[PDB]
């Protein structure tokens, strides 16, 4: 009772993602090797070799040289495959121009990308996704307004708030207000930096200058707006984004400090407070410490970080910054019903790329590869997509219910995991071209685990139980193939078969609040983004507007963001096409180049 696999036939464009890699039926266990010209089969690597020759001549030191590959064998003795972004043919919304690119035509595929196009090092959409997270500072303003009204003695009104925000938008990136003879920043360098606010009080929202407003009523469907507004209440939260260029000179911990300076100044200047009045220190303290929401928490000494590093971001904060939950595709994509699978598979895309390439690679390890093929596998060619939907189809038929409604018993988790594992293995076993595409055991193992957890999370609404299904895939995978992933893959899988429902000191913690500093997760690729997706989808499936923090969810519902948090697979593909214009470049102040 199962449909044709999505990796052989995309739902609308009917592309065969696996066949396209080879021009041969992927069911056939036969291939010729050593006949591709090595790297000459790759446009990017061939172009890179030519560029490298020019670079060597200019700088006097050799660089990229494919002929160094070991023992006379250039890379490319097998097909160096291209990739198709999963699911783009099933989108119908999100066609607006963004700060990074003109409007995408929803439904348009991105196929034929090379591996190097989806390397974090080469892909500005991926870098900008992280930069947008870490340059964000979020604060309640209630205490600052209280200090002004009682200590200083001046009334706060919508008019004074509007002036405050106009001044903060002048000074957050570019300008000065109070002082003579003060240096300023070139506006071209900081055009991505701005500040807005949101509130659950609709009368206040309507009284504010809409240019400074994240409009919850406009951004979210009514049931989600209702839930978010109920949590925000009659309060005002500020969302400020410091310059991308600035975090690229330093760290995300700059954000709360920077906004502390500039918001304090905007208060002084909008309310005419004397320079050096004692109230000033309440503003910076409020912004840095007193009423503050961070994307990430600090990390301990071995991996020391201030706030707003990727390693400090809780899984559920990665879940909730993603905005797929408010898209038409997520709200009506299952024949008019909500589609938590779409939420899962989108949210896991920045989840995986940022935690594994942005953080584990570009902070904790590194090098020229970005570990890119490992992670490309989770958002391309409809493979994980097919397996995840398979579990949902199976479960909806078996339990005769909708998403989020299968009883969240351990037995039901194990049944769904057994079927999704089975289906994953059936396809890798029956399609030699797919087994060769996902040539690393880690890709295949993470994919069956992720699909299982996606199905359980979407079908039960329970994020811990969905992630329990991930770890149960360990024996199901190992006892079938007699191989798993790379040498160090199954640290967390083995131990979380036990830790998921432990309460020992550093073992127990809800999945929403786990993150890259949970010790089991602190080292290895191929996992955290899956959990992130599962958390997001579990909440979506049970009728919630967010999983972990309504302030985070609202704070990223903002069309002025450089990265489109609603459609991350698409965005990464656009970066793969070299069509994503990031923020933070220094063109305004450097020579013609």
């Amino acid at each position: 009772k199962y449909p044709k696999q999505l990796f052989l036939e995309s739902k609308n464009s009917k592309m065969n993602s696996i066949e396209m890699k080879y021009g041969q039926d992927p069911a056939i266990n036969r291939a010729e090797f050593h006949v591709y010209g090595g790297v000459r089969q790759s446009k990017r690597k061939s172009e890179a070799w030519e560029a490298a020759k020019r670079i060597t001549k200019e700088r006097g030191i050799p660089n990229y040289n494919p002929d160094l590959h070991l023992k006379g064998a250039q890379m490319g003795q097998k097909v160096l495959q291209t990739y198709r972004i999963t699911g783009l043919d099933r989108e119908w919304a999100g066609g607006e121009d963004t700060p990074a690119h003109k409007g995408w035509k929803p439904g348009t595929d991105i196929a034929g990308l090379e591996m190097d196009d989806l390397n974090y090092e080469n892909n500005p959409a991926m870098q900008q996704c992280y930069d947008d997270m870490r340059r964000t500072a979020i604060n309640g303003l209630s205490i600052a307004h209280e200090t002004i009204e009682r200590r200083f003695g001046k009334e706060v009104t919508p008019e004074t708030i509007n002036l405050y925000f106009e001044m903060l938008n002048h000074n957050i990136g570019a300008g000065a207000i109070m002082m003579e003879h003060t240096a300023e920043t070139n506006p071209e360098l900081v055009k991505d930096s701005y500040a807005k606010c949101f509130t659950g009080n609709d009368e206040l929202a309507d009284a504010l200058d809409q240019r400074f407003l994240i409009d919850i009523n406009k951004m979210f469907p009514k049931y989600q707006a209702d839930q978010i507004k109920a949590e925000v209440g009659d309060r005002i939260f500020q969302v400020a984004r410091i310059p991308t260029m600035a975090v690229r000179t330093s760290d995300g911990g700059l954000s709360r400090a920077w906004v502390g300076q500039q918001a304090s100044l905007a208060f002084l200047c909008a309310y005419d407070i004397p320079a050096g009045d004692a109230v000033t220190s309440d503003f910076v303290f409020t912004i840095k410490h007193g009423d503050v929401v961070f994307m990430g928490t600090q990390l301990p000494y071995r991996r020391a970080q201030r706030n707003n590093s990727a390693g400090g971001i809780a899984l559920g904060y990665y879940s909730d910054c993603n905005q797929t939950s408010r898209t038409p595709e997520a709200l009506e994509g299952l024949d008019g019903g909500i589609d938590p699978v779409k939420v899962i598979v989108e949210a896991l895309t920045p989840g995986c790329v940022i935690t594994d390439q942005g953080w584990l690679h570009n902070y904790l390890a590194g090098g020229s590869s970005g570990w890119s093929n490992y992670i490309i596998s989770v958002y391309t060619d409809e493979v994980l997509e097919d397996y995840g939907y398979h579990g949902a189809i199976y479960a909806m038929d078996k339990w005769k219910c909708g998403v989020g409604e299968v009883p969240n018993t351990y037995e039901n988790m194990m049944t769904i995991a057994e079927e999704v594992s089975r289906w994953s293995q059936k396809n890798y076993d029956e399609y030699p071209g797919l087994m060769e595409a996902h040539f690393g055991g880690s890709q295949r193992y993470s994919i069956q685990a992720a699909a299982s957890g996606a199905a359980v999370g979407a079908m039960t609404g329970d994020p811990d139980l969905g992630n329990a299904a991930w770890h149960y895939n360990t024996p199901l995978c190992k006892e079938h193939y007699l191989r798993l992933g790379f040498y160090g893959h199954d640290l967390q899988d083995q131990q979380n078969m036990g830790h998921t429902y432990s309460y020992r000191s550093d073992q127990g913690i809800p999945y929403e609040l786990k993150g890259p500093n949970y010790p089991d997760f602190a080292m290895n690729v191929g996992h955290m983004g899956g959990y992130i997706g599962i958390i997001a989808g579990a909440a979506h499936a049970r009728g919630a507007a967010y999983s972990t923090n309504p302030i985070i969810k609202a704070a990223f519902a903002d069309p002025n963001l450089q990265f489109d948090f609603r459609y991350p697979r698409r965005e990464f593909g656009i970066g793969g096409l070299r069509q994503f214009m990031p923020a933070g470049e220094r063109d305004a102040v450097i020579p013609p180049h």
């Binding site: 209280e146 301990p300 299952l334 989020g404 409604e405 609404g461 913690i509 809800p510 049970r542």
Partner: protein, 466 residues
């Protein structure tokens, strides 16, 4: 060698508590009350049962406005959760639960005490407070001194609470992470038990500025809350915590030990009634009247003398006892804050008094101020970072571990404690805002709330040893 010189210890009413006390007997390395103070900070925590219960019930776990949502009205949302609407939406409840922790506080307290106790006679204490909303916990010395760390009360209490709740209510596997979160907050994703419900007076053990700083990482607001704004008790608590901290930093050693001990005795314990006498003489005046009183008292007691008269008639003074001169400046510094910030009943000028009492002293005498530069230096840094855009905050959020105020060797935070004690409610981030639970719970401990007489009585018990 022992610090045998005798001092008298006076209470905050200006009357003697104990006479003829060798300086040695108030030092942290000797005095049993000072040492018990450190021990109680190490061994005491509070369990917020009301907070844990609310987090589990509503899904508002941890901090930062976190909310794990359970949706009880899924069929009223205007959504279809089945393709084509085949099946109507059914709500689930998967992140929250109602446990009667506060109602059951007495039985919970008994179970907690049994899990923490090592042996029946070991002194473990668990007290039910706030109608069952809070437990005060003091672990035994036996447990606390097992290893090398000061965090054992925190860690054992969090695990014991988690285990005993899981057991008492016979909770299912789903509850393990959620009950853990109710007590531990975001641990171990955070090093801190961030947003949890087990609270220590001490900061997380990742947070020191250097080795030995733990007893310094205690906000002035905590000290003022715990002493309920009784000025010289706040001074004594702060000064004693600083004194313990400076032993642990290694600075109460060798040719610096007497200097460091005298800061504590003279500024923190009203030795020889100097602080009280200076406030009494100058209290109807200004900072400068305290300057006059301090120099006069130093002259009267033989601590300083005229060294040279310049042709204009200006006189350089010499310190006949440099460490005692420093300590007299430290005593005058707290008196000056009491007079100046006391007159205004407003704490903010404490930073200005710290700077200009010391500056005026040097211009008046030709002798170096407290800490040979640190008193003025911290007057500068603390003033700046309590009146500018860059960082800092109001006076009460500073501590001996705060980067702005750490430098002075033990004589700066006590004047902040004095000023905040005298404040009439001019702050937003006052003790009520940052330290209310700390003051309500830990302020019930007599030694924390009223250290002066305890330290003096303990010194009298050991005085004949030196």
């Amino acid at each position: 060698a022992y610090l045998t010189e005798k001092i008298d210890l006076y209470g905050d009413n200006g009357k003697v508590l104990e006479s003829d006390i060798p300086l040695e007997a108030v030092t942290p390395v000797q005095n049993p009350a000072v040492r018990e103070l450190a021990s109680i900070f190490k061994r005491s925590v509070a369990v917020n049962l009301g907070g844990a219960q609310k987090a589990l019930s509503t899904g508002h776990y941890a901090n930062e406005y976190i909310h794990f949502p359970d949706i009880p009205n899924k069929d009223k949302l205007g959504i279809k959760s089945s393709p084509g609407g085949k099946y109507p939406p059914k709500s689930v409840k998967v992140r929250t639960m109602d446990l009667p922790l506060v109602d059951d506080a007495d039985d919970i307290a008994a179970r907690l005490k049994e899990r923490l106790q090592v042996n029946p006679d070991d002194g473990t204490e668990v007290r039910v407070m706030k109608k069952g909303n809070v437990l005060y916990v003091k672990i035994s010395e036996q447990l606390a001194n097992t290893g090398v760390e000061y965090t054992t009360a925190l860690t054992t209490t969090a695990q014991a609470m988690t285990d005993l709740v899981m057991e008492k209510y016979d909770l299912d596997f789903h509850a393990s992470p959620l009950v853990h979160c109710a007590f531990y907050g975001r641990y171990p994703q955070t090093y801190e038990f961030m947003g949890g419900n087990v609270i220590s007076l001490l900061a997380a053990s990742c947070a020191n500025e250097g080795p030995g700083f733990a007893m310094r990482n205690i906000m002035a607001n905590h000290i003022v809350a715990a002493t309920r704004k009784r000025t010289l008790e706040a001074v004594a608590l702060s000064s004693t915590l600083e004194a313990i901290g400076h032993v642990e930093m290694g600075d109460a050693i060798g040719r610096w030990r007497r200097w460091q001990a005298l800061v504590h005795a003279c500024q923190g314990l009203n030795a020889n009634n100097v602080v009280y006498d200076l406030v009494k003489e100058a209290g109807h005046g200004c900072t400068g009247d305290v300057v006059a009183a301090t120099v006069g008292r130093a002259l009267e007691d033989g601590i300083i003398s005229v060294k040279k008269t310049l042709p204009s008639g200006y006189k350089f003074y010499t310190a006949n006892d440099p460490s005692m001169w420093n300590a007299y400046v430290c005593a005058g510094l707290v008196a000056a804050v009491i007079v100046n910030q006391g007159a205004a009943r407003a704490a903010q000028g404490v930073s200005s008094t710290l700077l200009y009492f010391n500056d005026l002293i040097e211009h008046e005498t030709g002798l170096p101020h407290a800490g040979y530069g640190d008193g003025m230096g911290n007057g500068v840094s603390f003033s700046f970072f309590s009146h500018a855009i860059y960082g800092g905050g109001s006076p009460g959020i500073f501590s001996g571990n705060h980067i702005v105020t750490r430098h002075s060797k033990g004589f700066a935070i006590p004047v902040i404690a004095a000023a905040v004690s005298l404040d009439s409610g001019t702050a937003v981030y006052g003790p009520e805002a940052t330290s209310g639970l700390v003051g309500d719970i830990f302020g019930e401990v007599d030694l924390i709330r009223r250290p002066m007489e305890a330290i003096a009585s303990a010194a009298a018990e050991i005085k004949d040893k030196f």
